Short mmCIF file of C-alpha atoms and ligand atoms in Angstrom, two decimals:
data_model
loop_
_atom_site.label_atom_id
_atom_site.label_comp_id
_atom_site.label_asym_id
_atom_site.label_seq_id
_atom_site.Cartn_x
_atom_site.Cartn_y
_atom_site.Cartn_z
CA UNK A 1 16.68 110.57 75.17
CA UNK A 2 18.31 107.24 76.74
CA UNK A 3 20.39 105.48 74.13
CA UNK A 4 18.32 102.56 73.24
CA UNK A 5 21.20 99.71 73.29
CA UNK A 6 21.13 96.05 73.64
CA UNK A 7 22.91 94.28 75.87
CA UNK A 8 26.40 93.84 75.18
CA UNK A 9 28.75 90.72 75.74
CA UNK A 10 32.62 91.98 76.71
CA UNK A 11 34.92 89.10 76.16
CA UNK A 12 37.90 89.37 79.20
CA UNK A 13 40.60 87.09 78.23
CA UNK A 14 43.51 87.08 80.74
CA UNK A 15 45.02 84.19 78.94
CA UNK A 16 44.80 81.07 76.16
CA UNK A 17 45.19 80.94 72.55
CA UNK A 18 42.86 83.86 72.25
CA UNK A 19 44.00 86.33 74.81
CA UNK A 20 43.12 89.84 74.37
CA UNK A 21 44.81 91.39 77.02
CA UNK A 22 48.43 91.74 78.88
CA UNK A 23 50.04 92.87 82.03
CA UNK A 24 52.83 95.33 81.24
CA UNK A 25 53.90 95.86 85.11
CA UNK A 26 53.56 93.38 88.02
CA UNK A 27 52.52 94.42 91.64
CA UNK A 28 55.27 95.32 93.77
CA UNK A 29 55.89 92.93 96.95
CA UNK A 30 56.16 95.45 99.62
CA UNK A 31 52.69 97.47 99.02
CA UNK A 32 50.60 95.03 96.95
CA UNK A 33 49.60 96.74 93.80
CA UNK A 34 51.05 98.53 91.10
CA UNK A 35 50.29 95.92 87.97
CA UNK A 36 49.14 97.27 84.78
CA UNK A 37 47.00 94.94 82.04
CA UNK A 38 46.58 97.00 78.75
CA UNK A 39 43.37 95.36 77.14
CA UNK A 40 41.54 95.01 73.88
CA UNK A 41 38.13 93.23 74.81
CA UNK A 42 35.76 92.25 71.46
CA UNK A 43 32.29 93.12 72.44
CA UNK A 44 29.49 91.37 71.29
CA UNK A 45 26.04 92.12 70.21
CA UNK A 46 24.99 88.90 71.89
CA UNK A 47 25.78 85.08 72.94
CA UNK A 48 26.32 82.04 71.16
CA UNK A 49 28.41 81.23 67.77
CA UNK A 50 26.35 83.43 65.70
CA UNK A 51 26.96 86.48 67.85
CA UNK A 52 28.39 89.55 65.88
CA UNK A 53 31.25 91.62 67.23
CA UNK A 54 29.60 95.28 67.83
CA UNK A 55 32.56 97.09 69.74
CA UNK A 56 35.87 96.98 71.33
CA UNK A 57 36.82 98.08 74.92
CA UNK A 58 40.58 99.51 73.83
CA UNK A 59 41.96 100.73 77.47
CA UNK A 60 43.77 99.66 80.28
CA UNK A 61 43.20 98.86 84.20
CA UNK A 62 45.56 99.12 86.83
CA UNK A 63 45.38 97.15 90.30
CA UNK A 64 45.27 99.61 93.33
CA UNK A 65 43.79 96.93 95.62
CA UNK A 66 40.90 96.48 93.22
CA UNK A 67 40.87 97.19 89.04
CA UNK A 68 40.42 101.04 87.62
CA UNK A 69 39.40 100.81 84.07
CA UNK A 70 40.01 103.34 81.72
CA UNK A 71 38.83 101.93 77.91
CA UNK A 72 37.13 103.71 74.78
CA UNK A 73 34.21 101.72 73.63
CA UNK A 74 34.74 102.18 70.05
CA UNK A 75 31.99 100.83 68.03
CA UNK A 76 32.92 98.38 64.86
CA UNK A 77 29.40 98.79 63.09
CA UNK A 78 28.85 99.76 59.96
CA UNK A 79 26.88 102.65 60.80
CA UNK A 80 28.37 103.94 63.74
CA UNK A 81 31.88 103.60 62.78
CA UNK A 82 34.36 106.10 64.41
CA UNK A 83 31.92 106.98 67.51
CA UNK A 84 32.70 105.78 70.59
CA UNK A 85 31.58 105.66 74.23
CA UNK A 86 34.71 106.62 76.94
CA UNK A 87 34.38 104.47 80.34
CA UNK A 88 36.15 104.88 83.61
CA UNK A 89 35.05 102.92 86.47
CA UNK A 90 36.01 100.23 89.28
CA UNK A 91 35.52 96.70 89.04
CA UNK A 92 35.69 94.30 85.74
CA UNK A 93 33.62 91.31 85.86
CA UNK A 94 31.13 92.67 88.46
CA UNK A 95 29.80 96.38 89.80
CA UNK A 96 28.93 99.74 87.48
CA UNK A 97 31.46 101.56 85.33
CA UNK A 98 30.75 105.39 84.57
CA UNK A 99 30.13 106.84 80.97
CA UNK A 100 32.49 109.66 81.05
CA UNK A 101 31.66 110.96 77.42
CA UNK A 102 31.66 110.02 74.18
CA UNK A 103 31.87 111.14 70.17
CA UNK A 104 30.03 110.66 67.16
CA UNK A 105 26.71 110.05 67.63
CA UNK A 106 27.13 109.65 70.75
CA UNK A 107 28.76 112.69 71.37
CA UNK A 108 28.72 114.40 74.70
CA UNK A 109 27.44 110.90 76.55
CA UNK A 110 26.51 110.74 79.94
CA UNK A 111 25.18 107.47 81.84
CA UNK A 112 26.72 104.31 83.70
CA UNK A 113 27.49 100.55 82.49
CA UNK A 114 26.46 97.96 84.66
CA UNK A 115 28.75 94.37 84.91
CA UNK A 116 27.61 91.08 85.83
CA UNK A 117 28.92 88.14 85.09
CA UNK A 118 27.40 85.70 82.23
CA UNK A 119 30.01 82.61 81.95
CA UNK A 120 32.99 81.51 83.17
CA UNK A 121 35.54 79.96 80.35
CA UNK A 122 38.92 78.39 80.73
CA UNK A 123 40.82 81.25 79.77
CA UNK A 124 38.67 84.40 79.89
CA UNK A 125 34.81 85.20 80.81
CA UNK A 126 32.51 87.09 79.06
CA UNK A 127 30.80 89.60 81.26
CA UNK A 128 27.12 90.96 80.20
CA UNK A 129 26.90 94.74 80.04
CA UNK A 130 23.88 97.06 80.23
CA UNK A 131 24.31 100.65 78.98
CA UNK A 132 21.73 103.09 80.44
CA UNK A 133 23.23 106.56 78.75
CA UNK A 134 22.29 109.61 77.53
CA UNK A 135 23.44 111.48 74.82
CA UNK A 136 21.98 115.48 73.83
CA UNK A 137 22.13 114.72 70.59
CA UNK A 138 19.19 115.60 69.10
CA UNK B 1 32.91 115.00 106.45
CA UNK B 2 29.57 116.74 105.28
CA UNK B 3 28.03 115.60 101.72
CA UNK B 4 24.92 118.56 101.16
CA UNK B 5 22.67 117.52 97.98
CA UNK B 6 20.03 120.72 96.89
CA UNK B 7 18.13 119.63 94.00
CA UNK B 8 18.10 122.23 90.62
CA UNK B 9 18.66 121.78 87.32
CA UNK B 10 21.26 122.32 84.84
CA UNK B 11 22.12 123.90 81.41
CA UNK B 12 23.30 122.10 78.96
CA UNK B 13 23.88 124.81 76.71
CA UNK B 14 25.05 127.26 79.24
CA UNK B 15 27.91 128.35 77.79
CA UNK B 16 29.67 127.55 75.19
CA UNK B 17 33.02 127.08 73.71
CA UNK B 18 34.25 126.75 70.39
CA UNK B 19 38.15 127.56 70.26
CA UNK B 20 39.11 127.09 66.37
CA UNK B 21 42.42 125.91 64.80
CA UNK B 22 44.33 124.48 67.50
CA UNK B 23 47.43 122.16 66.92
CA UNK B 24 48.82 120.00 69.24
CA UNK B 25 52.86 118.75 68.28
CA UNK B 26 52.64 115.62 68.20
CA UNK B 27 56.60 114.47 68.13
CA UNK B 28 58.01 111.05 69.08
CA UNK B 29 61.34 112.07 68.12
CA UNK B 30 64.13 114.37 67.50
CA UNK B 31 65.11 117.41 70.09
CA UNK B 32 62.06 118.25 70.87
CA UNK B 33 60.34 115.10 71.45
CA UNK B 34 57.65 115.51 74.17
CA UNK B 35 56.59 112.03 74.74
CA UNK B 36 58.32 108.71 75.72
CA UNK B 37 57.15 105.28 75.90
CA UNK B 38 57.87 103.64 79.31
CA UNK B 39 56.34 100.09 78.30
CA UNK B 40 56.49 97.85 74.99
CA UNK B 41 54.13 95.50 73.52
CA UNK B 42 54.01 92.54 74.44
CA UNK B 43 55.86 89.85 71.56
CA UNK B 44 52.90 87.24 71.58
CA UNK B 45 50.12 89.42 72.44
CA UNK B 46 50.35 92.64 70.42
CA UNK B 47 49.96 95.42 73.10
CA UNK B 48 51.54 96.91 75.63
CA UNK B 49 53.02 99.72 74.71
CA UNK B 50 52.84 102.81 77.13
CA UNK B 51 53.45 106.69 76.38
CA UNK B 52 53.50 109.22 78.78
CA UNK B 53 52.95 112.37 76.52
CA UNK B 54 53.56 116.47 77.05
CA UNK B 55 52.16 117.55 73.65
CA UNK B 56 52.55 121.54 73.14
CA UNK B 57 49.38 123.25 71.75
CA UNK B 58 49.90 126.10 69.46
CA UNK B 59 46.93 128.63 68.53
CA UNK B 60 48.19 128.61 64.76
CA UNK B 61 50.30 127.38 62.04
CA UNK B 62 53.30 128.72 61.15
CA UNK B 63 56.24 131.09 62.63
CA UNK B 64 53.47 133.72 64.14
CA UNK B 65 51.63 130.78 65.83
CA UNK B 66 52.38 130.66 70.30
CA UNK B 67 51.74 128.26 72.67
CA UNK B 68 48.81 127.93 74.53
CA UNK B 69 48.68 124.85 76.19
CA UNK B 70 50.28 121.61 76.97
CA UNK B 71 48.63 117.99 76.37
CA UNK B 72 49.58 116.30 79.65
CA UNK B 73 49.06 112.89 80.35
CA UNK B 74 49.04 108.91 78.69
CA UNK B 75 48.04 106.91 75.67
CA UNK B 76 48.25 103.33 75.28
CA UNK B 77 48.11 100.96 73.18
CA UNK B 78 45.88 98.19 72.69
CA UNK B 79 44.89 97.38 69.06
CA UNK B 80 44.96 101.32 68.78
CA UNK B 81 45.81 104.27 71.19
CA UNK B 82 43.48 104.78 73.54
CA UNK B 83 43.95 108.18 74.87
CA UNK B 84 43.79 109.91 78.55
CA UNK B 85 44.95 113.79 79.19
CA UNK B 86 44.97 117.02 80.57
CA UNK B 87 44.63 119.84 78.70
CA UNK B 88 46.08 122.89 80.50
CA UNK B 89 46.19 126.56 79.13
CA UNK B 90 48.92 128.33 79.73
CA UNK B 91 47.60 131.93 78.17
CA UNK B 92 46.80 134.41 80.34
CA UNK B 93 42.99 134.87 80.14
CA UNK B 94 42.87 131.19 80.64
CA UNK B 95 45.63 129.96 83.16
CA UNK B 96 44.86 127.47 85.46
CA UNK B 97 41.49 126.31 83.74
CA UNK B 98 42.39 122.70 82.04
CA UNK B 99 39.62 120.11 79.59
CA UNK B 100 40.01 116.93 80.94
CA UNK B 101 40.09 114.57 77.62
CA UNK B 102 39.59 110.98 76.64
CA UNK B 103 39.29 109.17 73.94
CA UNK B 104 40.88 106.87 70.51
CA UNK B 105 43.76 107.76 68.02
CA UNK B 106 46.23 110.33 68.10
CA UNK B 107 46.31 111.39 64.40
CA UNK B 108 42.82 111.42 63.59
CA UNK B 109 39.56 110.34 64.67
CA UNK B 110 37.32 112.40 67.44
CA UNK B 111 38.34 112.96 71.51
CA UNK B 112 35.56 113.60 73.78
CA UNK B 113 35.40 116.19 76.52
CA UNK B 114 35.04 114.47 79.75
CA UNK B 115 34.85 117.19 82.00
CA UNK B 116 37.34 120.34 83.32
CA UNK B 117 38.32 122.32 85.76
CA UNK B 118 38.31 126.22 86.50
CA UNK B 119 36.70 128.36 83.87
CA UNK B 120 35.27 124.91 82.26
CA UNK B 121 34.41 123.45 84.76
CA UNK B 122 31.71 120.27 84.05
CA UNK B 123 32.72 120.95 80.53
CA UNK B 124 31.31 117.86 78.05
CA UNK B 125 31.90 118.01 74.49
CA UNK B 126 34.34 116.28 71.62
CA UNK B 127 37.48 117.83 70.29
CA UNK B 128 38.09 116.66 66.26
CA UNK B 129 41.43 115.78 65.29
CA UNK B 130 42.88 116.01 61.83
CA UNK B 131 45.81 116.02 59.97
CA UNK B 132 47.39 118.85 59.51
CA UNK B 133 51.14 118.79 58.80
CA UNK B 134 53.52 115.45 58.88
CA UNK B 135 56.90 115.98 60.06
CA UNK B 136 60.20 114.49 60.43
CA UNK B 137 59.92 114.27 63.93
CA UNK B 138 56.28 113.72 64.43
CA UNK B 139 53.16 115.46 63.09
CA UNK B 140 50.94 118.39 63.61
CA UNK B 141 47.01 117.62 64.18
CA UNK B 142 44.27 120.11 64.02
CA UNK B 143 41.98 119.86 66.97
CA UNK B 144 38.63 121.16 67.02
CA UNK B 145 37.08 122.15 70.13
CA UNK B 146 32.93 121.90 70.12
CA UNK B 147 31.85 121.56 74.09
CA UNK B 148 29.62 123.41 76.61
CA UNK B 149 29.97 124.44 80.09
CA UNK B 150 26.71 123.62 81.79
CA UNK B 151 25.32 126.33 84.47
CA UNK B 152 23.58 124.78 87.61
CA UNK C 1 16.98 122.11 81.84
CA UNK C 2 17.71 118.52 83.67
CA UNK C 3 16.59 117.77 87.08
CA UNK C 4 18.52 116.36 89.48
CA UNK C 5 20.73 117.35 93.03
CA UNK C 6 23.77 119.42 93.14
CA UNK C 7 26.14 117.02 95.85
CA UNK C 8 28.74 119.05 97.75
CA UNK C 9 31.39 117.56 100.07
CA UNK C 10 33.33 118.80 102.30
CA UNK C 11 36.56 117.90 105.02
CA UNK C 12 37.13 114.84 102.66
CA UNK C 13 41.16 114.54 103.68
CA UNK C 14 43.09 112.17 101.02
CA UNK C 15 46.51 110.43 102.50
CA UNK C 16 48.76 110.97 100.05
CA UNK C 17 51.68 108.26 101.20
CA UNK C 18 54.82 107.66 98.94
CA UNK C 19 56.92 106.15 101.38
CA UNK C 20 56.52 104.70 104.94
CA UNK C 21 55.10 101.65 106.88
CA UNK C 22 51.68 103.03 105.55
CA UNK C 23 52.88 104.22 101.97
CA UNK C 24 49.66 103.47 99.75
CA UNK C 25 51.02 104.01 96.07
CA UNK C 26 54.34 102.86 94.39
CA UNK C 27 56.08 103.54 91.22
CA UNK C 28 55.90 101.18 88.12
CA UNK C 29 57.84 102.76 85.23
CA UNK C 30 60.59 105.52 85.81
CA UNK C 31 61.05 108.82 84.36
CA UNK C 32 62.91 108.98 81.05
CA UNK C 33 66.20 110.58 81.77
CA UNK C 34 66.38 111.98 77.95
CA UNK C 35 63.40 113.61 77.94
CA UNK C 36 61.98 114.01 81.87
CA UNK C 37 58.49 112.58 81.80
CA UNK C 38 57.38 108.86 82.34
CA UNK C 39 56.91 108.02 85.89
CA UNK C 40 54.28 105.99 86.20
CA UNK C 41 52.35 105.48 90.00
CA UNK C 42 49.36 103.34 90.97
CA UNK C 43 47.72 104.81 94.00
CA UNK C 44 45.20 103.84 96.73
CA UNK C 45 44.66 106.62 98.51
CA UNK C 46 42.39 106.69 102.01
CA UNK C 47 40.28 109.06 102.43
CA UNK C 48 38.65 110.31 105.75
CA UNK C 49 36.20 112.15 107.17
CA UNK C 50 38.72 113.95 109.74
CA UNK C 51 42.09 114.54 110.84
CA UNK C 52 43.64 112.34 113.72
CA UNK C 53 41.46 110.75 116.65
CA UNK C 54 39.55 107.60 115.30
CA UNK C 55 38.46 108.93 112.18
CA UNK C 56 36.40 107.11 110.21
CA UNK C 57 37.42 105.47 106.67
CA UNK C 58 35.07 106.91 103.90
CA UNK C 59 36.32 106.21 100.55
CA UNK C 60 39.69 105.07 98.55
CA UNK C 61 41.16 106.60 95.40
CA UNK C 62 42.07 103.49 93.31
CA UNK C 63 43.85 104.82 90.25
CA UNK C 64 47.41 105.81 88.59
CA UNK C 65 48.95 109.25 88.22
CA UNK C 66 51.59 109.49 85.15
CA UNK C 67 54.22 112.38 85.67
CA UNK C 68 54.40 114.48 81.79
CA UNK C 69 56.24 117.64 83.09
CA UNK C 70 53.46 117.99 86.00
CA UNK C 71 50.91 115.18 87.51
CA UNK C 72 47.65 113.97 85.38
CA UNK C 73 45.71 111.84 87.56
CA UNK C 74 42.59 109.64 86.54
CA UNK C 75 41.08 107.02 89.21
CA UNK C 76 37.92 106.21 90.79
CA UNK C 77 36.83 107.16 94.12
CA UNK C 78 34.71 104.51 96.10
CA UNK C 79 33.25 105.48 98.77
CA UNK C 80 33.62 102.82 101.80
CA UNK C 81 31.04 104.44 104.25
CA UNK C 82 27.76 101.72 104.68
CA UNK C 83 25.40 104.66 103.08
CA UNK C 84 27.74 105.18 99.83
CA UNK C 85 29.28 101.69 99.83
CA UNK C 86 30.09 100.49 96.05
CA UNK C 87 29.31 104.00 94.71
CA UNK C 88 32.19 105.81 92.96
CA UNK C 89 33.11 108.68 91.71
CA UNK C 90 35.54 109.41 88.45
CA UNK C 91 38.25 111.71 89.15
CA UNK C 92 40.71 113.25 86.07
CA UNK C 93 42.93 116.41 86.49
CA UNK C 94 46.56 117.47 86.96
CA UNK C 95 48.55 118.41 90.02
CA UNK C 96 48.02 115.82 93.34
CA UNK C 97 48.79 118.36 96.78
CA UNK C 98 46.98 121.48 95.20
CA UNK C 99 44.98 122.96 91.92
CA UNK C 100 41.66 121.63 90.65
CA UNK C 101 40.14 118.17 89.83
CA UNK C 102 37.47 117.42 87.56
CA UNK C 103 34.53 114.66 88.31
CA UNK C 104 33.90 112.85 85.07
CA UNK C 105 31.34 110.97 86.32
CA UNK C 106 30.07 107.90 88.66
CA UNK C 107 28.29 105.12 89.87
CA UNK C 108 26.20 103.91 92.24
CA UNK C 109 24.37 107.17 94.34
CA UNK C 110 26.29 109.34 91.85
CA UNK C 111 25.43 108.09 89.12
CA UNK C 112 26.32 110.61 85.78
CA UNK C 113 28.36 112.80 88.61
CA UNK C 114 29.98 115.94 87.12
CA UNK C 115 31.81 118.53 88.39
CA UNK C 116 34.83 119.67 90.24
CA UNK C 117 37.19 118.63 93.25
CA UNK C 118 39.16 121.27 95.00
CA UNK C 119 42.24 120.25 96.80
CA UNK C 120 44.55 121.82 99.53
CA UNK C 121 47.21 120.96 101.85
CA UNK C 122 46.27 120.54 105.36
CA UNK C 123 48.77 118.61 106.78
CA UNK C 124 53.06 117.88 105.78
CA UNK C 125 54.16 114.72 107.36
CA UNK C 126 57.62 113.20 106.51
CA UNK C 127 56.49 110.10 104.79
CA UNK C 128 53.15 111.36 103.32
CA UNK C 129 50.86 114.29 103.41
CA UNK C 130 47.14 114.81 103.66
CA UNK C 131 45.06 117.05 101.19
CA UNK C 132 41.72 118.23 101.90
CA UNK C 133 38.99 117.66 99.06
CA UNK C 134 36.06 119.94 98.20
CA UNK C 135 33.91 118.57 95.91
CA UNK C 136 31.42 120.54 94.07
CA UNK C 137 29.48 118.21 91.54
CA UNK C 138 25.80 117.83 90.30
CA UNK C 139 23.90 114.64 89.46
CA UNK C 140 21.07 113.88 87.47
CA UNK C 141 17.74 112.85 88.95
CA UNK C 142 17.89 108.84 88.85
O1 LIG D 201 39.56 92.29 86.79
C1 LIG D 201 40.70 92.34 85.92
C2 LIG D 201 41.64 91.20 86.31
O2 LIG D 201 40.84 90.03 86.47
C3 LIG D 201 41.62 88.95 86.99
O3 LIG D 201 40.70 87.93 87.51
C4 LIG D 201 40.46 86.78 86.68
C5 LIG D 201 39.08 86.84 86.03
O4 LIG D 201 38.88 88.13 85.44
C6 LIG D 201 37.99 86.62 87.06
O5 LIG D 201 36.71 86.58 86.41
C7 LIG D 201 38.22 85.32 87.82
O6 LIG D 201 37.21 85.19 88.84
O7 LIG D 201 39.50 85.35 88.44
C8 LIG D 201 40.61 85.54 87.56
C9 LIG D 201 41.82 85.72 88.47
O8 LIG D 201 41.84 84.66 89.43
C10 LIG D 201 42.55 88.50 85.85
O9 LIG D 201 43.40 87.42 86.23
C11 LIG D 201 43.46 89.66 85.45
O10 LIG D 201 44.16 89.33 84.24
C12 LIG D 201 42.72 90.99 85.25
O11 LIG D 201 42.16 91.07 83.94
O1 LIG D 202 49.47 107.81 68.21
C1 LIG D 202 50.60 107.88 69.07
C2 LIG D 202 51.69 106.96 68.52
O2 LIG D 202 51.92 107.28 67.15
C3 LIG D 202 52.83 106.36 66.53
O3 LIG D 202 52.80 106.54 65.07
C4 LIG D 202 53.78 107.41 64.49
C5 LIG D 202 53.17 108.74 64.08
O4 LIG D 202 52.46 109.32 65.17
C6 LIG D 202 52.21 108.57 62.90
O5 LIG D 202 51.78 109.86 62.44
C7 LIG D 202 52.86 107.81 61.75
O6 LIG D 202 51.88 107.56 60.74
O7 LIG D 202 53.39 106.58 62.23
C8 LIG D 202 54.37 106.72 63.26
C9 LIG D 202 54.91 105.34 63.59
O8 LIG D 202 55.50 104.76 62.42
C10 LIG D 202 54.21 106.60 67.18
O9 LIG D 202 55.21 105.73 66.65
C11 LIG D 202 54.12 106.32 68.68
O10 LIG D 202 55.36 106.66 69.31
C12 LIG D 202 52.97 107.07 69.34
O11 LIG D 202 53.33 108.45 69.53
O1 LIG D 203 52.39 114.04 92.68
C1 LIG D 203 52.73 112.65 92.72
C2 LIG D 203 54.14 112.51 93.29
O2 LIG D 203 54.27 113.50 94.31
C3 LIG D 203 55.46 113.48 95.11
O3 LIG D 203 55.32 114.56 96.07
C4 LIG D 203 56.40 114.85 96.98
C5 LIG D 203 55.84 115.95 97.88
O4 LIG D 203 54.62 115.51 98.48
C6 LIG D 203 55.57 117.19 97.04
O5 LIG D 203 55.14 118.26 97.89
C7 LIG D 203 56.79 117.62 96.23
O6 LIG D 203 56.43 118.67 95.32
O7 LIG D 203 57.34 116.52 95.50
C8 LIG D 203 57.68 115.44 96.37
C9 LIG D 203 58.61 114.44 95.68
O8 LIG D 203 59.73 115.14 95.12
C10 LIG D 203 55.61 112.09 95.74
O9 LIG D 203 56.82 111.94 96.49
C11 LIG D 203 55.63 111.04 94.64
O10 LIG D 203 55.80 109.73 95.20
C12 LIG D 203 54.34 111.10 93.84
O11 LIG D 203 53.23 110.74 94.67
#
């Protein structure tokens, strides 16, 4: 049973008026890495002004030469409020990101989360995400 | 290096573990705090904030109640506290075997079983989280273990 | 049942560097001198397929590892090799130099990984040491 989800919309805003997200360490001079953004991306259900805000990606990433994500996907809708989806991965805007598990009714999740970029904004992006999991709940 | 793949299949419902009334300590304060935060939020943002956490697991409530295991590892906060731990046992029939566990909120809420290592090993599952005693110091919450260890 | 291929490495050997010319993590926060937890390290390990001569780079682990009495660690391992290039593989468990890991799962040619990594000192150096990964993991078919 593969979790029959539309493609979602995650809205990465470094910066600007509606920033979602901020660096709590920098990178240190001598190695190169070491900077730490805690993040709370809105997810969307879709593009364009009407678009309805589905989930939020409520992690962090940390910069070791390229970004770890670490993020619970907790879902805002009505019905499936409380369960959430638990992602761990490399890369933001582009590659896959692994579904590591999940709760609710989507408990005991298993697939991966694939990234691609979908438009490029002043402040942020908004990167497109398809979700090809599995959950055994029958 | 060598990588070997052998195709098979694999249990879900190989075996299965359901350890009832646990309580982890959750204390930001007092003497026996077991947690610190080592960032803040961020003034204009809203998030930030950091906590490296050692939460002690008891197998009860009360005087009678021992310790079992220890919470080790991070939550953070962005709108709410995303959360990212180890949990070791420490009893004897069970030392060295640790639930790897993500997932939101500390008080309440559900934490999934990402995997594990020793005797639950490939472990998936959720562990519920409810509110079982509020403190002076922090609070006690009732965790509910409900995963399975899969058999290749 | 679910069908798929049990994956088993072995002689993976992670460079665990602290300090050095080649040191490959560095701290961020500090430990809490009131209560003794809080240290705070982003890491990029190497890892090879061999010890000394020209051994090939095969992957990086790209994460942190927060210090709470002992060492929880949680990154990704990406593989660098041309076969496994872009595919990872997602790595949380205590203790760095010995003890178990647990695979959480992965991308790419591991897609929906799980299982375990076994670790074990191999070699002691005085700015860094090198631990030797077993992984024992199974992935669903496709
Ligand atoms: O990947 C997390 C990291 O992204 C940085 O990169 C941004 C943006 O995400 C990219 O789409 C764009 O191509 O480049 C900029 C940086 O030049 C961002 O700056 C960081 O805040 C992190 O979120
Ligand atoms: O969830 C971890 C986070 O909890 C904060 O909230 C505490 C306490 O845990 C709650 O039970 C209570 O309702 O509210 C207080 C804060 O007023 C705590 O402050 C943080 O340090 C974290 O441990
Ligand atoms: O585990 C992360 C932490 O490990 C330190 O490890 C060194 C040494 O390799 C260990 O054998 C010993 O137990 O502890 C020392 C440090 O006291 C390393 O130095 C740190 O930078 C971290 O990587």
């Amino acid at each position: 049973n593969q979790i029959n989800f539309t493609k979602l919309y995650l809205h990465h805003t470094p910066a600007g008026p509606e920033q979602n997200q901020s660096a709590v360490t920098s990178n240190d001079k001598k190695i190169g890495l070491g900077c730490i953004v805690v993040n709370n991306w809105s997810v969307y259900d879709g593009i364009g002004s009407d678009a309805k805000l589905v989930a939020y990606a409520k992690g962090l990433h940390v910069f070791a030469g390229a970004w770890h994500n670490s993020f619970s996907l907790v879902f805002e809708d009505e019905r499936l409020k409380g369960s959430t989806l638990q992602v761990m991965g490399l890369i933001v805007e582009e590659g896959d990101w692994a579904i590591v598990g999940g709760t609710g009714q989507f408990a005991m999740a298993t697939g991966v989360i694939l990234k691609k970029m979908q438009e490029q904004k002043q402040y942020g992006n908004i990167i497109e995400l398809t979700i090809h999991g599995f959950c055994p709940l029958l």
